[PDB]
Amino acid sequence: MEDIKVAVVGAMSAGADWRISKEACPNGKTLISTLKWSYTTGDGKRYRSTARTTFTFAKPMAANYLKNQPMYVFRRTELKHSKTEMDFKEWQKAFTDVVGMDEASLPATHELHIFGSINGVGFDMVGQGSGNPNVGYEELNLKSTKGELQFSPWILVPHIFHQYLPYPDGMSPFQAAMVDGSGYQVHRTVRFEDGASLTVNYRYTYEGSHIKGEAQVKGTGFPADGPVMTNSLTAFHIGPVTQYGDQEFTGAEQAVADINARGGIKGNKLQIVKYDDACDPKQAVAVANRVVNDGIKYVIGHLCSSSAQPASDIYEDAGILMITPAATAPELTARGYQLILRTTGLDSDQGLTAAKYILEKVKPQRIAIVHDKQQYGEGLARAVQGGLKKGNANVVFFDGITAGEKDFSTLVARLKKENIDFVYYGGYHPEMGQILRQARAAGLKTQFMGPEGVANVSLSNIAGESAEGLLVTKPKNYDQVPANKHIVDAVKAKKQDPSGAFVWTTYAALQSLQAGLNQSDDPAEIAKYLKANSVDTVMGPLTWDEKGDLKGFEFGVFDWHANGTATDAK
Ligand SMILES: CC[C@H](C)[C@H](N)C(=O)O
Ligand SMILES: [Cl-]
């Protein structure tokens, strides 16, 4: 009665603050710990590692430890750093199962000497710390003795004292070995997704309640242009596509809960497996190869057009089904592929809907068209330009800006000088929000319009009152259909937001997969069944053409509001 795995591919997720270590003991003198650890770049990309840690005890562990395994340890860390100094904190909690709390002497002080090389670049750091062995807390300050670190200081986390960890009903085996005096040694091996590796070896001496630790490090095989050797690792920040990933995970989690509550697929439960492509082409190909090697046959997601297209090549070649709830560029479904479907519409249709609204209902005097030079935004800007030229509208200029720009002073001064009364922007909320708040600060009265990628609460968060009165194209308000009220209430009961279109397109993708899995487990048979039939969903009855596109899909025109809400424009 094994679970059916479904991959859900998000983008620039935060993820869990706590990470789980699994502890096992093959004999009385050895404890083995296994760990998955992903780092994040300043760019919002993931850098993936796995670790195996070996603890060697001089005297055998007490029988109670050997009878009670495996154990699970939840840990979280904080780092502030310069290029010469590190300030660190760690929290640790042990359990006999996978369910968190849900929301002579033991040690008091310690010192660390950590040294070695990364790609042959030498380092040496020393410093003092303290902690509480009753609750699993520790803190540490480290200073360089050899000047500036010429690699990311994050590569030395988590390596920078399990003598501070208690177990549920008494001392950990680490604490018992320190109190006895005979102690333990540690060896860790880390493997990275680019083929790099790092080893650490530890030795300790106990002077009463004070621990003296020594750690020797050797790292090799890091790419010269990678984030370790360029100092490009950071703590997680919200990024440009986080809003889109959060909507997809909200809709997938509620749909899988509802399906499983009704008995799953002929009694077998669905299990979500989460991945993250950062809407980046190289990360999308790395994710798709991992999904195939993990044995998964069904994928929901790859959200942006520039990441869904390279991923689709890998899934088609390997015989895997892919359903995107969000990618709208026509080229995805224009190449003869048989295993690719959507639960959203096409930018050829979205751009023509915008051009007809401008010609029929707005009738402006002087138009500018702006885009971000990416597949989605530049495609829409070209579709709108063609529609307006056919209607003989006055387009004064057509121009590109750079994605990630925060200073729009040149564009704002040009709109003021050239007396522009209407702008169409093709692109995402981060750039549109900066353009709106900088335009109103400088006294512009211009009417703005954009596509479904700007119609979200992150646009309102960035622009504030400057967002009021923006025109948008987007899918219908599915959250206002009475038949969908039970889903709206279940999402609001978790303090989550059911208003974004990608909640509904993602829920509908899981309902479409469910209908297929009731007929066959084989991806090619599922794609054939959906292309020949109608499926009832939260979006209404869905049908697909032979290339995997929705038949009769319509984008609406709405007024956007500063409170993150959309109303019918007419
Ligand atoms: C996340 C989807 C975005 C907004 C857009 N529709 C694209 O295809 O890139
Ligand atoms: Cl460990």
Side-chain angles (χ1 to χ4, degrees), residues 34 40 84 98 120 126 131 148 154 162 197 202 261 313 375 403 406 410 452 469 473 476 485 535 555 564 567-568:
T34 52
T40 48
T84 54
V98 184
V126 297
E148 193 192 340
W154 274 103
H162 292 348
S197 64
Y202 302 79
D313 299 337
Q375 180 170 17
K406 302 300 164 185
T410 301
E452 103 284 1
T473 52
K476 265 70 195 227
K485 191 71 211 306
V535 181
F555 294 91
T567 59
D568 274 17

Side-chain angles (χ1 to χ4, degrees), residues 34-88:
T34 52
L35 173 72
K36 299 243 158 197
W37 184 298
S38 297
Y39 296 88
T40 48
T41 70
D43 261 9
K45 299 172 197 178
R46 301 279 201 201
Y47 184 56
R48 304 153 178 87
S49 79
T50 66
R52 182 181 175 93
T53 311
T54 307
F55 300 81
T56 304
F57 292 86
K59 293 163 89 186
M61 285 174 276
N64 26 287
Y65 296 122
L66 306 182
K67 304 212 216 85
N68 295 117
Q69 56 171 304
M71 298 287 312
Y72 299 92
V73 190
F74 290 64
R75 302 190 170 90
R76 79 171 182 96
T77 62
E78 286 186 10
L79 178 66
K80 295 161 288 138
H81 70 91
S82 66
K83 294 168 177 155
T84 54
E85 196 160 340
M86 295 170 77
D87 285 297
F88 173 84

Side-chain angles (χ1 to χ4, degrees), residues 14-33:
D17 231 324
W18 298 91
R19 293 195 181 80
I20 305 169
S21 288
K22 184 177 74 176
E23 305 197 326
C25 301
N27 60 57
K29 281 174 175 176
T30 315
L31 186 157
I32 305 298
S33 188

Side-chain angles (χ1 to χ4, degrees), residues 92 105-109 130-138 161-167 170-172 175 178-179 209 211:
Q92 322 179 57
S105 184
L106 284 171
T109 62
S130 71
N132 185 338
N134 300 304
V135 306
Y137 176 76
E138 75 197 69
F161 293 82
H162 292 348
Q163 307 91 338
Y164 290 110
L165 174 70
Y167 265 21
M171 287 189 290
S172 64
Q175 285 177 335
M178 177 178 171
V179 165
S209 64
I211 306 167

Side-chain angles (χ1 to χ4, degrees), residues 244 303-306 326-329 347 376 428 452-453 502:
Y244 306 148
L303 289 170
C304 302
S305 290
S306 27
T328 51
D347 286 329
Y376 172 70
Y428 299 152
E452 103 284 1
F502 303 150

Side-chain angles (χ1 to χ4, degrees), residues 261-272:
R262 252 87 225 199
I265 311 307
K266 313 185 330 188
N268 297 296
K269 304 302 175 194
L270 294 182
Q271 179 187 331
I272 295 172

Side-chain angles (χ1 to χ4, degrees), residues 283-312:
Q283 198 165 128
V285 169
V287 164
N289 288 143
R290 189 182 298 281
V291 166
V292 174
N293 284 337
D294 286 348
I296 294 174
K297 298 179 177 196
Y298 330 107
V299 174
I300 308 294
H302 298 94
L303 289 170
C304 302
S305 290
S306 27
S307 71
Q309 188 168 326
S312 73

